[PDB]
Amino acid sequence: ELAYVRDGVIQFEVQQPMIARDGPHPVDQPVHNYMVKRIHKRSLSAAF
């Protein structure tokens, strides 16, 4: 039944917590990333 079902979606999450115990990293700002899913189709051929 997967033939009739097209491509689905993936689960991706990001976190932007506080900062309270590590090395002296430079101060930055929260940012977000964008991603896309592009999957093609590959198939061989045969005959008799």
Partner: protein
Amino acid sequence: DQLLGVLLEKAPPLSLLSPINKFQPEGHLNRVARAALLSDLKRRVCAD
């Protein structure tokens, strides 16, 4: 953890200096002896 690096800063070079202070009971030597010891320590550091 390292933003307040007041207590987390201690790098005293003593591995090559511990014998030179353990051998001397008092260390009250003359200028020539002090200069010779300093030159020997510098040579040992260079050739480490």
